[PDB]
Enzyme design. Structure first.
Site, short mmCIF file in Angstrom:
data_model
loop_
_atom_site.label_atom_id
_atom_site.label_comp_id
_atom_site.label_asym_id
_atom_site.label_seq_id
_atom_site.Cartn_x
_atom_site.Cartn_y
_atom_site.Cartn_z
N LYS A 159 5.59 -1.95 -5.38
CA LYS A 159 6.24 -1.90 -4.08
C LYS A 159 7.40 -2.85 -4.13
O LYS A 159 7.21 -4.00 -4.52
CB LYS A 159 5.30 -2.35 -2.95
CG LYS A 159 5.88 -2.17 -1.56
CD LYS A 159 4.79 -2.22 -0.50
CE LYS A 159 5.36 -2.00 0.89
NZ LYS A 159 4.33 -1.91 1.97
N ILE A 165 7.58 2.61 -3.03
CA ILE A 165 6.63 2.45 -4.18
C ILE A 165 7.20 3.22 -5.38
O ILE A 165 7.73 4.33 -5.22
CB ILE A 165 5.16 2.90 -3.86
CG1 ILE A 165 4.58 2.10 -2.69
CG2 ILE A 165 4.24 2.76 -5.07
CD1 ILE A 165 3.97 0.75 -3.04
N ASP A 175 -2.58 1.30 10.82
CA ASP A 175 -1.91 2.50 10.29
C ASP A 175 -2.89 3.44 9.60
O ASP A 175 -2.66 3.90 8.48
CB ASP A 175 -0.76 2.09 9.37
CG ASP A 175 0.24 3.19 9.12
OD1 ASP A 175 0.33 4.13 9.93
OD2 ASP A 175 0.91 3.09 8.08
N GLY A 211 8.66 -0.94 2.48
CA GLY A 211 8.88 -0.97 1.03
C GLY A 211 8.61 0.33 0.29
O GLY A 211 7.57 0.96 0.51
N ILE A 261 8.14 7.14 -6.06
CA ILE A 261 7.13 8.16 -5.70
C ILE A 261 6.93 8.33 -4.18
O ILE A 261 6.37 9.34 -3.74
CB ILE A 261 5.73 7.91 -6.33
CG1 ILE A 261 5.29 6.44 -6.19
CG2 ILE A 261 5.65 8.37 -7.77
CD1 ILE A 261 3.96 6.12 -6.83
C1 LIG Z 1 2.29 4.03 0.30
N1 LIG Z 1 1.65 3.49 -0.91
N2 LIG Z 1 1.47 2.26 -1.03
C2 LIG Z 1 0.87 1.98 -2.19
C3 LIG Z 1 0.67 3.19 -2.85
C4 LIG Z 1 -0.05 3.38 -4.13
N3 LIG Z 1 -0.03 4.63 -4.74
C5 LIG Z 1 -0.74 4.91 -5.89
N4 LIG Z 1 -0.71 6.18 -6.46
C6 LIG Z 1 -0.09 7.31 -5.76
C7 LIG Z 1 0.19 8.41 -6.78
C8 LIG Z 1 0.82 9.63 -6.08
C9 LIG Z 1 -0.12 10.20 -5.00
N5 LIG Z 1 0.54 11.35 -4.33
C10 LIG Z 1 -0.46 9.12 -3.96
C11 LIG Z 1 -1.02 7.85 -4.65
N6 LIG Z 1 -1.52 3.94 -6.51
C12 LIG Z 1 -1.55 2.70 -5.89
C13 LIG Z 1 -0.85 2.42 -4.73
F1 LIG Z 1 -0.97 1.21 -4.23
C14 LIG Z 1 1.17 4.15 -1.99
C15 LIG Z 1 1.21 5.68 -2.15
C16 LIG Z 1 2.41 6.06 -3.04
C17 LIG Z 1 2.82 7.50 -2.78
C18 LIG Z 1 3.67 6.36 -2.23
#
Ligand SMILES: Cn1ncc(-c2nc(N[C@H]3CC[C@H]([NH3+])CC3)ncc2F)c1CC1CC1
Ligand SMILES: Cn1ncc(-c2nc(N[C@H]3CC[C@H]([NH3+])CC3)ncc2F)c1CC1CC1
Lengths: 291, 295
Positions: free
Chosen positions: A34, A19, A124, A17, A11
């Site tokens: 991750k 995700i 960040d 890393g 995603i």
């Molecule tokens: C960078 N990062 N690290 C942990 C997470 C991360 N992302 C989500 N959900 C995403 C669903 C798609 C939405 N557009 C954004 C949130 N839930 C928990 C997370 F720790 C994320 C965002 C994920 C989109 C990469």
């Protein structure tokens, strides 16, 4: 994975890393996973998991289900969260109401204060790293991603890390503090200055140091720095309430090792919220979306 | 991509398919809750999704029935937004290596008979009873078996008078061949008995890992259904259930004996399994095979 995890599709990318969605198979619980290549030269994923563990039980801090290794991957499994503030900004037509900006500001200042209270700086701060909760925590802003985080004071003595110069820029540039661009070791003030830019970003739709021309990355960063330094705060924040300028001036004037006055900063925005006559219902712009 | 439907729902990745449509994981932006989203691509003037949504509405409040949040139209799609539930019984069966213990089978049977009785109490027959159409709840409702997918359901009696629909022949083979009743294979109008016979095959599938009419290939849907039908008709219940408690065969024989318009004795069927459960010394504690997993 873990007697229980189904790795799904990618995603996005976080610090150090990618995700993936994944699923707690027996539970039917969609999670975020991750991945760090277990054979990488700079293993940082278990470091990040221990920072999360030190922050455990904090309001707006993500829970870690499982940290480990599988196949050729160090893995960290996190509870699933909702859209980013960038995602919600887009859903809201890249305009937030003043009320929503002030509601976000209050939580975001507090989330930063909490991380600092546990001896870390985030480094960040940007819309992509704040996520809304799901279910009963849907109006809670979470902060995510400690892959760039650093301890700024000793856990026993509280002695602050020393001042350092000529550092290369390690996050990315749009929301970086002036001192970060100038090579100064990041400290608590820089997290807060970045939040100030994030709040102006939500007010405007863009910052005036987006879309600058340069031949190389080094230069692009230099041009963003130059633009930030040469745009007075009164010009940056023209036509918006004076609180946004006052907040940024305050953060910019903090000493390297100063403990910020987080309550003063929250109170600026609270006083504005009172003056505007907004109701104390904690309703964000996106909560009014109807079918 | 962040896709958005019905103004307030994020449409995520596809998680599977149901009757007449695909299912997606999503999120309700406004209320901050995960949901499941069903999409029907409309090809004719007589689409199915709004009809299905009204069946769910009629069932609302029943134990083990998902609530519907919204049904509406968007471009050439109908969209239905539902309460998110946990894994299906087929998902869990795979996770458990296609082996359930007797205790698990009997815990599931008790609840599945009850869900089918409830749908019948609301004047409908389901018509596609199979493991994929039973989901476990999430979290604290994880002990609860839900029934889903009303795309093939039909009213079998009047709500007030209880007048039953008429017997009919030459019906098309709707549902899933693996679990269909013998009468369904023969083109007979489905009724309450047929939902319950299907459940009986599901229970034996859980006991065995597979049914003995799985595997056979055909060129056409009719030839496939026929090979299954023939194997089903030609395999005695006591050969199908050989080496399992007698209750599994008693259950199927009871279902096969029912007249078209008979009201099943759901209580007898539940008691048959509960009596076994207790004679085996099991504790009724909702501890399924998948709840025994260690870290
Ligand atoms: C960078 N990062 N690290 C942990 C997470 C991360 N992302 C989500 N959900 C995403 C669903 C798609 C939405 N557009 C954004 C949130 N839930 C928990 C997370 F720790 C994320 C965002 C994920 C989109 C990469
Ligand atoms: C056919 N259909 N119709 C409605 C739903 C459906 N599915 C869920 N959750 C799914 C999450 C992923 C699990 N692997 C399976 C269950 N919750 C509610 C539903 F109505 C389903 C099941 C989805 C797998 C298609």
């Amino acid at each position: 994975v873990g007697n229980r995890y189904r790795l799904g599709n990618k995603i996005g990318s976080g610090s150090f890393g990618d995700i993936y969605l994944g699923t707690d198979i027996a539970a039917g619980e969609e999670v975020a996973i991750k991945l760090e290549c277990v054979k990488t030269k700079h293993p940082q994923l278990h470091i990040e998991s221990k920072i999360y563990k030190m922050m455990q039980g904090g309001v707006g801090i993500p829970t870690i289900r499982w940290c480990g290794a599988e196949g050729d991957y160090n893995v960290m499994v996190m509870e699933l969260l909702g859209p980013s503030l960038e995602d919600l900004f887009n859903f809201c037509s890249r305009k937030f109401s003043l009320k929503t900006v002030l509601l976000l500001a209050d939580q975001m200042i507090s989330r930063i204060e909490y991380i600092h209270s546990k001896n870390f700086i985030h480094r960040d701060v940007k819309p992509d790293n704040f996520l809304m909760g799901l279910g009963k925590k849907g109006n809670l802003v979470y902060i995510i991603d400690f892959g760039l985080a650093k301890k700024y004071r000793d856990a026993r003595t509280h002695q602050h890390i020393p001042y350092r110069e000529n550092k290369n820029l390690t996050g990315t540039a749009r929301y970086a503090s002036i001192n970060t661009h100038l090579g100064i070791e990041q400290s608590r003030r820089d997290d807060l200055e970045s939040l100030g830019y994030v709040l102006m970003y939500f007010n405007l739709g863009s910052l005036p140091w987006q879309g600058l021309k340069a031949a190389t990355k080094r230069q692009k960063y230099e041009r963003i720095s130059e633009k930030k330094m040469s745009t007075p705060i009164e010009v940056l924040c023209k036509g918006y309430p004076s609180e946004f300028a006052t907040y940024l001036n305050f953060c910019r004037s903090l000493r390297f090792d100063d403990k910020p006055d987080y309550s003063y900063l929250r109170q600026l925005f609270r006083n504005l919220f009172h003056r505007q006559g907004f109701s104390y219902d904690y309703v964000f712009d996106w909560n009014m979306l109807k079918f």
